[PDB]
Design a binder for this molecule. Sequence first.
Ligand SMILES: [Zn+2]
Ligand SMILES: [Zn+2]
Lengths: 127, 24, 91, 214, 100, 96, 199
Amino acid sequence: SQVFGVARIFASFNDTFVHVTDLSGKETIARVTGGMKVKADRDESSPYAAMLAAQDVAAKCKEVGITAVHIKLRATGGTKTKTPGPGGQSALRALARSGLRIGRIEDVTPVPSXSTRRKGGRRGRRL
Amino acid sequence: MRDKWRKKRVRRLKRKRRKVRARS
Amino acid sequence: TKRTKKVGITGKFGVRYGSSLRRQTKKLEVQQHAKYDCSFCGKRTVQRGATGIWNCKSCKKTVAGGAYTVSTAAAATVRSTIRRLRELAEA
Amino acid sequence: VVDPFTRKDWFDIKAPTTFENRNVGKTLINRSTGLKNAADGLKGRVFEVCLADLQGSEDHSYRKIKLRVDEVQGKNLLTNFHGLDFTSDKLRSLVRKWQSLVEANVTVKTSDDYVLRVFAIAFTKRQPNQIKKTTYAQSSKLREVRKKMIEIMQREVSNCTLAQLTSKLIPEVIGREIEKSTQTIFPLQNVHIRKVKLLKQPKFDLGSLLALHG
Amino acid sequence: PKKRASNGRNKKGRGHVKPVRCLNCARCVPKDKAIKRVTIRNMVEAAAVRDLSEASVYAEYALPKLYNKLHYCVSCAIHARIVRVRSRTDRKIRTPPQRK
Amino acid sequence: NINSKLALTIKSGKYTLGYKSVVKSLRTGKAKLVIIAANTPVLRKSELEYYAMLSKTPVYYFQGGNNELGTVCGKLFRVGTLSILDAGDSDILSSI
Amino acid sequence: PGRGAPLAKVAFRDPYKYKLREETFIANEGVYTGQFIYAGKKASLNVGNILPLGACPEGTIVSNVEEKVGDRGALGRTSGNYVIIIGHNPDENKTRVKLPSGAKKIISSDARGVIGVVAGGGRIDKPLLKAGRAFHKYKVKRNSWPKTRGVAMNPVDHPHGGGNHQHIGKASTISRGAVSGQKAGLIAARRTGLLRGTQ
RNA sequence: CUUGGAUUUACUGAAGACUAACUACUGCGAAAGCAUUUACCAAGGACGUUUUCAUUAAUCAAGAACGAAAGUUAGGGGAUCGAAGAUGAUCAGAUACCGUCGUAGUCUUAACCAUAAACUAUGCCGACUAGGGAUCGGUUGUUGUUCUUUUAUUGACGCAAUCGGCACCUUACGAGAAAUCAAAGUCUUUGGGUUCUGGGGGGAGUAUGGUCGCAAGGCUGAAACUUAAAGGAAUUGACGGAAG
Ligand SMILES: [Zn+2]
Ligand SMILES: [Zn+2]
């Protein structure tokens, strides 16, 4: 029936990667970022830019033969923040409305079990 | 001035005082 | 009486070679002239021959050790490591 | 300039007979050329599919099994068990405050020399008539739970092969037995095998593969 | 003078507590003093729960939540208005606000 | 536990300290137990336990060296081996 | 003399004629007189025993290790040095080891090594303190002491000699492709100066 | 940094650190501190005690042990962060805050240093004084409770108690300049024992001497001179590039 890939989405506070792989993850079928669709470095992670990045992936997903994608959303993870960026939420909505079908959905933001020192210093970054 | 910096300024001043006495 | 306040065995060097070099010598030359307990006969009669050679006057057992101590830190670590690796492999 | 997806040929994945919905899905690879054979370059891959997909039931939706391909049969991919894991949502859904958490792991080889690290997690159960807020078990008790938890983990894995163990992992026989044997110590809830890791494999036995693939 | 009896933290019968890094500005802050908020949000926005439930190939698929425990320092929390300044008499109250 | 029972035998019962007395006690059959320190030479140990086989005497292998065995007996000197001729108020013979 | 490590004379029996064979080993630390040394494929994992590399588990500390099967020992022979067995690759019969310099090497598993650390370690920790001590050190090694600085010679004697001030004049880093008579200084140096940080 | 394939993807692999969530008005420790498992080692408090010795005690000049971080010396390790330094911005200028790297350091083994808002800014020991409920370890009597196992001599939970704690709520007999305080009460109705410390603000923890330390520095420690104030708690207002 459905030809399942995996839509691996990274949503940072600077960019949004819409990356569709095979079910193994060792074949890149389509990878579109929020920053290839915009002209300002500031909005390159915006929810609107994520919609544009998501829709053209489905266009490439359709022509190859992919008809359904699993969602593996992640944030920056590690020592940095675990909250998903604005792009991942709007890109997730944009995919379902492009005709691409959806199976399992999961968050795979990397989580340390401690961890190394976080950048910024003891007193943080003072703005 | 701040007390911590006044303390540090004296610390660097004492070190100079100690050295200039070493010349004799 | 206490003949020297701090130089100890390095009092044979007088004022030469610098205090830092004399302090490094004192730590190791005390160890290499000390008497250690024999692990074989139990007496405190083990002394250094050349480097790495430690003879016991009583039981005439000679053991290979460190340059200035009968046992070095890394050797004891290896002995426990080998003992551990031995018992796993042979169950 | 080249349209790189021109030489990608799709192969079909097959799950072992220990699993029910054996049609995992499809992949792509550069087609077999003279230099590099697609058969050789596609084995060793790892496929991660939810346990709900390979079993149908929605109760396994929080466990995902990694499937490793070790041999290709023309257009069909023959895989083998590679590991077990929980979903990040589920383990988070289980770790709440005012309750005691106990974890245990152990390394043990199967009947046919499959070295595995099995990870089990359990939590203290709150009584129904309970009044006090916190359900805390003493550290001596949790040592007893963990000590009992490892030996049962060792006993049930070393006595059975991976296929027999995988048939134990589907219904959580070990999870039921861990909770059963810890009843005399402390009431436990949500007793699980939260992870299984393949550490070392022996020489590949293509005969035993087909025995799990027909 | 003394503003609080707890000295702004929750350390009694103790010498030292390992600190935490603020989520926002990565500042070291003691774990007990850090303002901790446990949030459980739906992974998909409430508006998109429908069309993503129509693209689902699985019937009645219970989508997951996102679990996250947040840590803020005093400046992190006050600026983000997670906590607000209270009156001198309202400082004594430590019962949770009744909003949910 | 054994160091306690052995210590009790010292202040209460009969014993001999030293290799020559232990072998001499095994020859006459007056020995009830033989205790050998860990760092006793293997050749001497192996023939101490040969006499015990002939004398029908149990042997206990102390875990410490002749320095620790000596101080258990209340002695300020090394005791490489000892034999208990008469266990006194203690029960070391039935404990071993 | 000339060696910081002690040597152990070990007597073996000749398998084929009635004779005793004396062997000179480098004494591993903890080896004592009268100790039994076992050498072979079936020897147990004990300090001082000689075992093939494949027969040792990972993390085994070994010394006097062979690069080639039957060269009778090449690696880790100075006092306090040893070779760590990093891993095994059994199907091509290979073992990865870590050398005292940090280099990783791949050796045949049939290569042999002596379990333990070379004795005499810590020898460098004590200063020599005296020209006389160095004189006695090299009296039993070779004629390489004392060393005159090349910058202190005349232009005939060294590339660094000459000048109205003692100075090298040109870069002291010399190409690897230089010829004999030119390679005085830092040969084929990838970098110079005080080593800051990790390498 | 990137068409010499960056970022991203999956798997395999190596290093060092750190032990997330559980995690708390919770525990232990003389304090500093202590959070992956297990094994060992030697300690410890509390409770139980119709066991034992009988004043063996409290606080203590002089003198000792330990003592966060940083720093010092010598090896080993050096992933990440990152003083110094270099850098791209911002700015009138910023060699600052922001960004990118980065050396000591961060880790450890041997030794020093002996200081912190080392704070409960509250010496230690002792007795009494007002109510209340939670909670930890022990121990003492008890359930429409589930489980062991089908029940006990299981465990958990539940209800009454007391010991010790870490604390918390109200009140003010009383205290306080007030904030506040169950001790900061039992202090002009002035006396339980004892140690240390202060005598307006600066100069100044400076100079000098001594003493300890490798050094950095620690401990002890003035005077001249100068000044009418410095400061504590709270009230009103004014102001805020704070909240409602
Ligand atoms: Zn001896
Ligand atoms: Zn801040």
